[PDB]
Write an enzyme that holds these catalytic residues in place. Structure first.
Site, PDB file in Angstrom:
ATOM      1  N   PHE G  23       0.720  -1.321   0.097  1.00 31.41           N
ATOM      2  CA  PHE G  23       0.028   0.006  -0.070  1.00 31.41           C
ATOM      3  C   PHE G  23       0.676   1.046   0.173  1.00 31.41           C
ATOM      4  O   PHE G  23       1.917   1.430   0.731  1.00 31.41           O
ATOM      5  CB  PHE G  23      -0.838   0.124   1.344  1.00 31.41           C
ATOM      6  CG  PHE G  23      -2.161   0.869   0.969  1.00 31.41           C
ATOM      7  CD1 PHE G  23      -1.918   2.308   1.260  1.00 31.41           C
ATOM      8  CD2 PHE G  23      -3.372   0.327   1.023  1.00 31.41           C
ATOM      9  CE1 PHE G  23      -2.976   2.998   0.858  1.00 31.41           C
ATOM     10  CE2 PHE G  23      -4.250   1.134   0.991  1.00 31.41           C
ATOM     11  CZ  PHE G  23      -4.399   2.271   0.970  1.00 31.41           C
ATOM     12  N   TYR G  57      -1.408  -3.537   8.203  1.00 37.19           N
ATOM     13  CA  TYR G  57      -2.123  -4.039   9.151  1.00 37.19           C
ATOM     14  C   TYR G  57      -1.462  -5.447   9.320  1.00 37.19           C
ATOM     15  O   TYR G  57      -1.184  -6.011  10.146  1.00 37.19           O
ATOM     16  CB  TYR G  57      -3.606  -4.327   8.666  1.00 37.19           C
ATOM     17  CG  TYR G  57      -4.697  -4.786   9.866  1.00 37.19           C
ATOM     18  CD1 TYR G  57      -4.782  -5.965  10.211  1.00 37.19           C
ATOM     19  CD2 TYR G  57      -5.128  -3.963  10.400  1.00 37.19           C
ATOM     20  CE1 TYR G  57      -5.529  -6.554  11.149  1.00 37.19           C
ATOM     21  CE2 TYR G  57      -6.095  -4.104  11.687  1.00 37.19           C
ATOM     22  CZ  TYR G  57      -6.342  -5.369  11.743  1.00 37.19           C
ATOM     23  OH  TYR G  57      -6.929  -5.727  12.604  1.00 37.19           O
ATOM     24  N   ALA G  80       3.617   2.815   5.093  1.00 36.21           N
ATOM     25  CA  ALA G  80       3.024   4.263   4.879  1.00 36.21           C
ATOM     26  C   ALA G  80       1.630   4.436   4.981  1.00 36.21           C
ATOM     27  O   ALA G  80       0.817   3.680   4.090  1.00 36.21           O
ATOM     28  CB  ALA G  80       3.478   5.160   3.983  1.00 36.21           C
ATOM     29  N   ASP G  85      -8.748   9.839   4.382  1.00 33.72           N
ATOM     30  CA  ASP G  85      -9.944  10.372   4.901  1.00 33.72           C
ATOM     31  C   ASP G  85     -10.455  10.032   6.190  1.00 33.72           C
ATOM     32  O   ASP G  85     -10.458  10.763   7.369  1.00 33.72           O
ATOM     33  CB  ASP G  85     -11.259   9.899   3.672  1.00 33.72           C
ATOM     34  CG  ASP G  85     -10.710  10.252   2.483  1.00 33.72           C
ATOM     35  OD1 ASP G  85     -11.160  11.434   1.886  1.00 33.72           O
ATOM     36  OD2 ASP G  85     -10.144   9.533   1.830  1.00 33.72           O
ATOM     37  N   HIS G  88     -10.442   5.203   9.559  1.00 29.19           N
ATOM     38  CA  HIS G  88      -9.910   4.088   9.231  1.00 29.19           C
ATOM     39  C   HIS G  88      -8.465   4.352   9.418  1.00 29.19           C
ATOM     40  O   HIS G  88      -7.652   3.170   9.835  1.00 29.19           O
ATOM     41  CB  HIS G  88     -10.217   3.930   7.559  1.00 29.19           C
ATOM     42  CG  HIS G  88     -10.066   2.573   7.115  1.00 29.19           C
ATOM     43  ND1 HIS G  88      -9.106   1.642   7.098  1.00 29.19           N
ATOM     44  CD2 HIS G  88     -11.212   1.749   6.761  1.00 29.19           C
ATOM     45  CE1 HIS G  88      -9.459   0.513   6.597  1.00 29.19           C
ATOM     46  NE2 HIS G  88     -10.726   0.473   6.641  1.00 29.19           N
ATOM     47  N   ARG G 127       9.369  12.351   4.275  1.00 28.84           N
ATOM     48  CA  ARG G 127      10.281  11.439   5.075  1.00 28.84           C
ATOM     49  C   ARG G 127      10.595  10.161   4.409  1.00 28.84           C
ATOM     50  O   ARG G 127      11.486   9.395   4.731  1.00 28.84           O
ATOM     51  CB  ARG G 127       9.100  10.854   6.205  1.00 28.84           C
ATOM     52  CG  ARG G 127       8.615  11.542   6.980  1.00 28.84           C
ATOM     53  CD  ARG G 127       9.491  12.440   7.947  1.00 28.84           C
ATOM     54  NE  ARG G 127      10.635  11.758   8.042  1.00 28.84           N
ATOM     55  CZ  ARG G 127      11.134  10.791   8.964  1.00 28.84           C
ATOM     56  NH1 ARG G 127       9.760  10.602   9.782  1.00 28.84           N
ATOM     57  NH2 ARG G 127      12.119  10.103   9.126  1.00 28.84           N
TER      58      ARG G 127
HETATM   59  O1  LIG Z   1      -5.970   0.841   3.917  1.00 32.81           O
HETATM   60  N1  LIG Z   1      -5.312   1.800   4.037  1.00 32.81           N
HETATM   61  C1  LIG Z   1      -3.721   1.649   4.353  1.00 32.81           C
HETATM   62  C2  LIG Z   1      -3.302   0.423   4.049  1.00 32.81           C
HETATM   63  N2  LIG Z   1      -4.155  -1.026   4.054  1.00 32.81           N
HETATM   64  C3  LIG Z   1      -4.942  -1.320   5.267  1.00 32.81           C
HETATM   65  C4  LIG Z   1      -4.390  -2.540   5.906  1.00 32.81           C
HETATM   66  O2  LIG Z   1      -2.973  -2.281   5.894  1.00 32.81           O
HETATM   67  C5  LIG Z   1      -4.729  -3.914   5.339  1.00 32.81           C
HETATM   68  O3  LIG Z   1      -4.181  -4.202   4.240  1.00 32.81           O
HETATM   69  C6  LIG Z   1      -6.103  -4.329   5.334  1.00 32.81           C
HETATM   70  O4  LIG Z   1      -7.080  -3.312   5.816  1.00 32.81           O
HETATM   71  C7  LIG Z   1      -7.170  -5.510   6.353  1.00 32.81           C
HETATM   72  O5  LIG Z   1      -5.997  -6.498   6.462  1.00 32.81           O
HETATM   73  N3  LIG Z   1      -1.927   0.310   4.387  1.00 32.81           N
HETATM   74  C8  LIG Z   1      -0.965   1.202   4.556  1.00 32.81           C
HETATM   75  O6  LIG Z   1       0.325   0.949   4.404  1.00 32.81           O
HETATM   76  N4  LIG Z   1      -1.570   2.509   4.638  1.00 32.81           N
HETATM   77  C9  LIG Z   1      -2.940   2.837   4.239  1.00 32.81           C
HETATM   78  O7  LIG Z   1      -3.256   4.117   4.179  1.00 32.81           O
END
Ligand SMILES: O=Nc1c(NC[C@H](O)[C@H](O)[C@H](O)CO)[nH]c(=O)[nH]c1=O
Ligand SMILES: O=Nc1c(NC[C@H](O)[C@H](O)[C@H](O)CO)[nH]c(=O)[nH]c1=O
Ligand SMILES: O=Nc1c(NC[C@H](O)[C@H](O)[C@H](O)CO)[nH]c(=O)[nH]c1=O
Ligand SMILES: O=Nc1c(NC[C@H](O)[C@H](O)[C@H](O)CO)[nH]c(=O)[nH]c1=O
Ligand SMILES: O=Nc1c(NC[C@H](O)[C@H](O)[C@H](O)CO)[nH]c(=O)[nH]c1=O
Ligand SMILES: O=Nc1c(NC[C@H](O)[C@H](O)[C@H](O)CO)[nH]c(=O)[nH]c1=O
Ligand SMILES: O=Nc1c(NC[C@H](O)[C@H](O)[C@H](O)CO)[nH]c(=O)[nH]c1=O
Lengths: 155, 155, 155, 155, 155, 155, 155
Positions: G23, G57, G80, G85, G88, G127
């Site tokens: 992500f 996560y 990161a 928004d 979350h 960063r």
């Molecule tokens: O969702 N936004 C983000 C994200 N994904 C959410 C989470 O990491 C995950 O992959 C699933 O939500 C549930 O397993 N990961 C980031 O590094 N930045 C974000 O801003």
């Protein structure tokens, strides 16, 4: 494409010199201590010379000398000139900067410009080991890299 | 870690020269008197040469000369350029600053930038022995330390 | 017209004592370090006694004692009381000031009032080696001059 | 450089006296209880004398006496004068402060100024064991340190 | 009704001492020069001793001494403390004033409080020979009158 | 303390050169005429060379040359750059200033910076013989003093 | 007082693992590349394992595993999460943070939290090698120090 980068690992063998202005000692002392520490932290040992000069203006010639003495591989100059009031700030700042530059060029020896030129004291405090890091230390690290670069790249 | 600092105590044996601009004499005179006094106050005696130049701009070459004459260990340059009106201020200020820098570098002799660059006259008055101290004196003291530093550190 | 001034050069032979309040240590420590350094810088050596008292209020009697012990020629008292909130500031400040005064008078020994009485911490930081110089050091230097004055003028 | 600091550990052997003003008892009682507790907390035991005086003004002479009785090593004076209305506040505050000072000086015995001089009651409440700590306790601790200092430094 | 007033005409025979603080030299020097001049202007001759002390705080003990030396008939203390920033101003100002007072009282010798306590530098400039006259000179004159008064009134 | 000042009286024997930029002729012409006049006014006679260059930028090299020709003792450069519109002003102004500086330094011959750097035309008019005096003349006078200084001080 | 600090110089011998979330790849990629580079820059070599997980996560368990595998001395987790928004952001941020924490604790292996939690993308960009440095690199360096600390301090 042949990345000629310096080495931060091969320190110890080198000889460095720190030059610090007493002005704004409250910060400079720290700044210096930082540089110093970093050196040791990076295994370097030839007990680095620290030369005290009253003001940043002085850095120029002082470095100039040390550089031409051929004794050191890199000299790091530390100082801090806070925008207190008048253009005097500028005056110094320029001379300081210019000096260090000239030194490095003329001596052919890397002279690190580790001098703060923030406006207010507080900003400085931050560059001296605050949330802004520590210019002193950074400068030392740089000194290393540059020195090393010179004996690996040389030409 | 070997603190190579100058010595303020071993004065007397040294030879210094003060260079002062006549412009803003009201302050400069004082400024100079201050430096002078400080020298004596610091036991130095070889009756320091005081060279009068009309304006701060002049400081450059004048110092340049004195420096290259190898006769003095440190030359302190005094002057005061108050932000009266136009960028002329800048012009002078830069040249003044730059000059002293260049002098020190080229001569390899510490040339003290003891020139005020405040805006209004009043601020100056303060740097010339007011609640802001006395740059003149400070400069002298610095001259000493630098000179001394040079013959203790040398290399 | 016979200028009976003290001598900053004839230090070493004298004995001094610094008295510092632990309160606002962040500054006082520095302040003290400054005074100390200055002593050495001025060739003095009899390894000056530094007496720690918790608060500036204490300075009074503490100095009082040291002074009356006839062991030192000048005692420099350091402390810093920042106008944090209430008139408590005043209270202390007065007592502090008054104490040091009384001490000097009663002991007939110069007791240097090297205590900061700025409003905000920052201003203090500046007096403790910032762009405002270093009261600590200044105080030391003064101690010297006063002591010396006493044995040159005496009567 | 020989840090002559007091000792908080060698308490028990000493004799102290607390002097508290009944005025603003709501706070002073607490204040006192605090000082007391601290003493015991710091292993001291000679069952410290607590002298009640109606008002802070009284502190002066009362301490004066206790001090001159040579029976105690340090007397801590507690009181609280909240800026209720008129300059009366000042009047008292000064006298209180001055008194304690004079006492300490004249008696040559450390008299701790543990009297609150905040504006509103609430601020006081905080200095009496609130988020501002407890002046009472602090004062006791200080008493200790001062006493100790006196018999370790003495001269 | 027997107007016991001092005499400004019978100067010469007397012995005086000026004590000046170096701080704010820009003004004090003048101040002093003024007092000095006045003395001579008033036919006095025993070449008055001028004692330099770094700061106004110092005036106290210094005068104290000179006074007790029984050598002078009146000592005039000069200094200038401009309300630069903090209550530090007050601190000093009080101590300065108080000191000079105490000195005069304890010594039984008139000690002239010739110290400026204006806010801004400019006001001072005026008291030092500006449109506000010259405190220095005035102080001298007063010294004379007081001394004389003492040997005419005596009892 | 040996005031090495130049001499304005011993002119005539010396050789000078004026270099003026044609730009802003309306003022420069005057400026020059002023310098010229002053020379004669100061008994000098070797019929001074006046070198015309189109713009202030030119001053640099031109002086450079004249200086290195060793024919003159001091060269005075005149010009006027009014802050008409863009940073072009700066550009020129710097180069102009820097040039004259460099010239003086490199040639070891005093090159007087007699160039106006006011904003509006009017201010200039004033420096060219208005209520602001006449830079041209001043510059000439300075040229003299500097030259003289060089042959009296020399070393 | 025995400063048990880690060693940045003794890298090479150690085994590390980087775990990065895909992500915000635009940044993470960089972030990772940075960490990687730093490792090499610090002479380390055992060709560090880089584990890709889709989102921050995931970092938790993934590290959890790697840590418990006892194969690495320190695992650095990069990711990161820009405050795009809704809360979350929080949700993730917490879990991310918490996870890495838990991992480190449970595994007894240092897991570096090298995940950006700035609001806007731009801050992040900074960063990731912008004027804000590079968290990735910093994290690596830290990984080193921690690992090293563990085998030098151990107990
Ligand atoms: O969702 N936004 C983000 C994200 N994904 C959410 C989470 O990491 C995950 O992959 C699933 O939500 C549930 O397993 N990961 C980031 O590094 N930045 C974000 O801003
Ligand atoms: O004045 N301000 C500063 C300063 N003094 C100027 C100069 O370095 C020198 O000591 C003398 O000017 C002439 O040689 N030096 C600093 O390091 N920081 C400042 O902010
Ligand atoms: O003009 N203002 C100033 C000044 N004159 C400028 C210059 O030094 C010179 O004398 C001639 O310009 C040509 O060389 N010199 C100062 O020391 N302070 C000023 O405030
Ligand atoms: O409370 N504020 C301060 C303080 N404590 C007061 C006093 O010095 C003493 O320690 C005890 O009060 C007993 O008199 N001491 C300082 O040096 N600065 C302060 O800003
Ligand atoms: O009056 N207010 C106060 C007070 N009384 C003043 C004084 O101590 C005395 O009792 C008589 O004035 C005459 O000796 N004492 C306090 O400790 N706090 C106060 O807020
Ligand atoms: O600080 N400001 C001032 C000052 N210094 C304080 C004092 O004289 C002394 O030298 C030491 O404080 C302790 O002995 N002296 C002045 O004449 N004016 C000031 O405005
Ligand atoms: O443009 N304005 C000015 C100017 N021209 C610039 C320069 O001197 C030169 O002639 C050429 O740039 C390059 O040689 N010269 C001046 O004396 N004053 C001005 O106000």
């Amino acid at each position: 494409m042949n990345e000629l980068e310096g080495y931060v690992t091969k320190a110890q063998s080198f000889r460095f010199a720190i030059v610090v202005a007493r002005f704004n000692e409250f910060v400079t002392r720290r700044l210096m201590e930082g540089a110093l520490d970093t050196f040791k932290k990076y295994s370097v040992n030839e007990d680095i010379d620290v030369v005290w000069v009253p003001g940043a203006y002085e850095l120029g010639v002082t470095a100039q000398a040390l550089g031409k003495s051929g004794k050191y591989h890199a000299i790091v100059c530390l100082g801090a000139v806070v925008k207190g009031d008048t253009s005097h700030y500028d005056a110094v700042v320029n001379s300081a900067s210019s000096g260090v530059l000239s030194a490095g060029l003329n001596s052919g020896v890397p002279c690190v410009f580790g001098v703060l030129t923030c406006d207010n004291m507080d900003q400085a405090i931050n560059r001296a080991g605050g949330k802004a890091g520590n210019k002193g230390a950074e400068s030392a690290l740089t000194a290393i890299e540059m020195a090393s670069l010179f004996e690996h790249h040389l030409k």
